[PDB]
Amino acid sequence: SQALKNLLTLLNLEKIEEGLFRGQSEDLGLRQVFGGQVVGQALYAAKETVPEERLVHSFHSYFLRPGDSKKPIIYDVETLRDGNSFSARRVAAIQNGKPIFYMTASFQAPEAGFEHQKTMPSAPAPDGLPSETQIAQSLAHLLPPVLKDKFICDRPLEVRPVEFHNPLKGHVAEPHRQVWIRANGSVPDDLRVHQYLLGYASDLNFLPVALQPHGIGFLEPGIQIATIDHSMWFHRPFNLNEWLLYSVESTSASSARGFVRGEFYTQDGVLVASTVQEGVMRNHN
Amino acid sequence: SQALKNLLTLLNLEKIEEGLFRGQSEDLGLRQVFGGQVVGQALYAAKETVPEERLVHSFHSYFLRPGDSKKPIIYDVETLRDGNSFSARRVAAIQNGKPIFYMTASFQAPEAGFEHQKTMPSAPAPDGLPSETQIAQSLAHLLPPVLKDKFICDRPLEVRPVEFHNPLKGHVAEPHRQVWIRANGSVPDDLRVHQYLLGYASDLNFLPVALQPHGIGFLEPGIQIATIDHSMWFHRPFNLNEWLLYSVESTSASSARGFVRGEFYTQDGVLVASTVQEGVMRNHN
Ligand SMILES: CCCCCCCCCCCC[N+](C)(C)[O-]
Ligand SMILES: CCCCCCCCCCCC[N+](C)(C)[O-]
């Protein structure tokens, strides 16, 4: 459970000045910075500069350089606009004197209006599915004692895939994936926190779906995937303490790029948010 | 023919300086600037500052204020990055000393890579379908020609809807729409041009689809819709001199906002581009 509090602490940026923050990275595997961390932290920085009643409803972002998790990241927020209804902000993520990421987010106050939504796709309940932590721990029995011990996944989130796609091997399959996600611990009763946490989560089990028709795992040798842009629209309020289905599809792949679109639904079938991302996808020999 | 020539001319911006242009606004219908005009002009501006071999593959944009078509628009391009593969640019559309819109676009040179795509949805051929212009002429067989002798056919694009949704009245219908589109004249043999023309076109028959479940047309009195953000990914090359199916869906509407996702297909079924947009949707009484 320490993992979730460690993530929430990590997303709660250190203020250097108005609209100027500093964030730590890492710690959980792989040296490059996880895209979700940048998204989550950029969202925090952005919301800190917006009227409290205005919640993020959308954001667009482009990744320009790989982030180094050994170094902190500086987030500089620019106020683009504050109208009778919307507040827009642009966040620059900086490391080594260069922008590594830009996000533009829009915020709006709560309001009733036209309501309609796509019907949730059918998917088996999370109850009968193993978590990625279970799957990893089972695969770890393949490692020798020296390595088996040190490893282990204490995660801030719990993920139960409908179909498991091993990133180390990969098998041919339709460009669709469904995973169930929820916080592995208690998330504060503040919707804003749930939002940037979902922002964080939205970058998991996403881009890799574009590799399925080609049976390649994203961690295999010679395979390189990297996010170019990540966008999200928060349609309705939600509680990440409860399950959410992340329904993902890859409608296209071409010119060394992979494209994916996702949707988050509550177990009861409420459409909570939508996501879109394109990233580099190369097979180097 | 003239209408297409006029639009292409209007999209061909006047250069004030490097990465600094000036664009005129359409006379063609509606005092407020058509979003498509801004998108098309911003793309032109961006592409002018990019290496010739690198074609736009995606862009994100936000509209901050309504544009006045009675005035020109200044487009200021900022170079965000020029890497071994990708070039990124941010375009600011200014009018009245204020930004009315921002777009960030990414460009990449052609390359061979993983290929796969969603299967084109079923749709009738454009052959037996009347154009919107034809439909307008048909429904207009009434009232004094005094006004009927001014509003007519000449559009830069020909649009043939699979199902007609009258913006003036509107009827309840599932949140899906299909319209066939092609240039009404000859587009020069430059993919870049076809691309920003498609950008222009991508803002048509889009957002209104979110109003369908509610049986309201966007030209009805007291009904207000306005684009907040428009994004697009150019998956493959295409020829706007030929027919393209614009398949649109509205997966959600809430909090006075409407969300739509679109896809362009060649008649032969090739997925050419994807779009996503959210906009304000209000009924003022
Ligand atoms: C051996 C530990 C098991 C964890 C494997 C970690 C893989 C890194 C996954 C995050 C990569 C996300 N993405 C789309 C940007 O590639
Ligand atoms: C008889 C009136 C038919 C409408 C003529 C106006 C065409 C311009 C349409 C652009 C409107 C775009 N949108 C979604 C922002 O409303």
* CATH code of B258's domain: 3.10.129.10
Asked if B112's CB is within 8 angstroms of A99's CB, the reply is: no
Q: Are residues A210 and A81 in the same domain?
A: no
Mutate to test the interface with A, among B62, B94, B223 (most CBs of A within 10 A): B62
In one-letter notation, the amino acid at residue B273 is: A
User: Is B84 within a domain?
Assistant: yes
Give the CA-trace dihedral at A32, A34, A37, A43, to 10 degrees. 110
Ligand nearest to the CA of A217: 1
Domain count, chain A: 2
Residue labelled with tokens 């205005």 = A54
Would you tell me which residues 68-97 of chain A have a C-beta closer than 8 angstroms to some C-beta of chain B? 80-81, 85-86, 88, 90
CB contact under 8 A, B278 and A117: no
Residue A260 burial (CB < 10 Å; 0-12/13-18/19+)?
buried
Q: Which helix (H) or strand (E) holds B132?
A: helix B132-139
B149 and B106 share one domain: no
Per-residue tokens: B232: 């697009």
Of B257, B73, B254, the C-alpha closest to A86 is B257
Closest CA to B119 of A201, A176, A125, A7: A176
The residue to mutate among B138, B218, B229, having the most atoms of ligand 2 within 8 angstroms of its beta carbon, is B218
Tell me how far the alpha carbon of residue B244 lies from the centroid of ligand 2, in angstroms.
20
Retrieve residue A133's tokens. 């932590």
> Under an 8 A CB cutoff, do A106 and B81 touch?
no
Helix (H), strand (E) at residue B40: helix B35-48
Same domain for A154 and A265, yes or no, is: yes
Which residues of A are marked as active site?
203, 227, 277
Indicate if A108 and A163 belong to the same structural domain.
no
Q: Are B32 and B8 in contact (CB under 8 A)?
A: no
Q: Is A34 in the pocket of ligand 1 (CB under 6 A)?
A: yes
Q: Distance between CA A78 and CA A21 in Å, rounded?
A: 12
Ligand 1 neighbourhood includes A259 CB (under 6 angstroms): no
Q: Which two tokens stand for residue B177?
A: 């729409």
What resolution in Å is listed for this PDB structure?
1.9
Closest CA to B106 of B171, B151, B61: B61
Number of H helices, E strands in chain A: 5, 13
Question: Does a structural domain hold residue B123?
Answer: no
In a domain, A125, yes or no: no
Point out the domain boundary residue: B115, B150, B165: B115
Q: Which amino acid is at A250?
A: S
- Of the candidates B115, B145, B166, which is a domain's last residue? B115
Kindly give the number of the ligand 2 atom that is closest to the alpha carbon of B218: 16
Q: Write out chain A residues lying below 8 Å of B113, CB-based.
A: 253-257, 281-283
Residue with tokens 């051929």: B125
Name the β-bridge partners of B79: B89
Domain that holds residue A95: 1-115
In b/e form, how buried is each residue of B107-123, taking b as 16+ CB within 10 angstroms?
bbbeeebbebbbebeee
The answer to whether B56 and A255 have CB atoms below 8 angstroms apart is no
Residue B97 DSSP code: T
User: What is the rounded CA–CA span in Å between residue A117 and residue A238?
Assistant: 15
Contacts with A111 from chain B: Cβ below 8 Å: 255-256
The answer to whether B80 contacts A88, with C-beta atoms less than 8 Å apart, is: no
Strands A14-17, A55-63: pairing kind? unpaired
Same domain, B25 and B141: no
Q: Does B214 touch chain A (CB under 8 A)?
A: yes
Residues B18 and B144 in one domain: no
CB A78 within 8 A of CB B78: no
Are the Cβ atoms of A261 and B259 closer than 8 angstroms?
no
Please say whether the beta carbons of A118 and B251 come within 8 A.
Answer: yes
Q: Are residues A171 and A87 in the same domain?
A: no
| B184 in Cβ contact with B155 (< 8 Å) | yes
∠ CA A139-A143-A145, nearest 5°, is: 130
Are residues A183 and A99 located together in one domain of the fold? no
Distance B97 CA to ligand 1 centre (A): 45
B261/B176 Cα distance (integer angstroms): 10
Residues belonging to chain A: 285
Ligand nearest to the CA of A136: 1
Rounded distance, CA A4 to CA A141, Å? 26
Q: Is A185 inside a domain boundary?
A: yes
Q: What is the DSSP secondary structure assignment for residue A165, as one 8-state letter? A: -
Rounded distance from Cα B152 to ligand 2 centre (Å): 14
CA B238, CA B182: separation in Å to the nearest integer? 11
**CA atoms of A266 and A180, how far apart (whole Å):** 10
Structure determined by: X-ray
> What angle in degrees, to the nearest 10, is found between the helix axes of A35-48 and A191-201?
150
Spatial separation of the C-alpha atoms in residues B198 and B56, rounded to whole Å: 12
The C-alpha atoms of residue A128 and residue A113 are separated, in whole angstroms, by: 37
Residue A192 lies in a domain: yes
Interfacial A residues in 3-42 facing B (CB < 8 Å): none
Beta strands A271-283 and B98-108: pairing type? unpaired
Radius of gyration of chain B (CA): 19
Task: Tell me whether residue A122 is in a domain.
Answer: no
Provide the β-strand partners of residue B249: B176, B261
Nearest to B34 by CA among B249, B239, B226, B254: B226
Among B115, B142, B162, which residue terminates a domain? B115
Helical segments of chain A, H only:
2-11, 35-48, 132-139, 145-148, 191-201
Residues B88 and B188 in one domain: no
Q: Both tokens of residue A117? A: 């939504």
Which tokens belong to A22? 């500093």
Clarify whether residues A73 and A7 are in a common domain: yes
Enumerate residues 6+ apart whose C-beta is below 8 A from B89: B46, B49, B50, B77, B78, B79, B80, B104, B105, B107
Q: Cα separation of A123 and B55, whole Å?
A: 39
Same domain, B94 and B152: no
- Specify if A88 maps to a domain: yes
Would you tell me which residues 119-158 of chain B have a C-beta closer than 8 angstroms to some C-beta of chain A? Answer: none
CB A253 less than 6 A from any atom of ligand 1: no
Q: Is the C-beta atom of A277 inside 6 A of ligand 1?
A: no
Q: Determine whether B191 is exposed, middle or buried from the number of CB atoms within 10 Å of its CB (0-12, 13-18, 19+).
A: middle
* Domain assignment of residue B76, yes or no: yes
- Contact residues on chain A for B254, CB-CB shorter than 8 A: 113-115, 117, 235-236
| Three-state DSSP string of A75-124 | EEEEEEEECCCEEEEEEEEEECCEEEEEEEEEEECCCCCCCEECCCCCCC
Asked if residue B198 and residue B249 are part of one domain, the reply reads: yes
Q: Which residues lie below 8 Å from residue B142, measured CB to CB, with a gap of 6+?
A: none
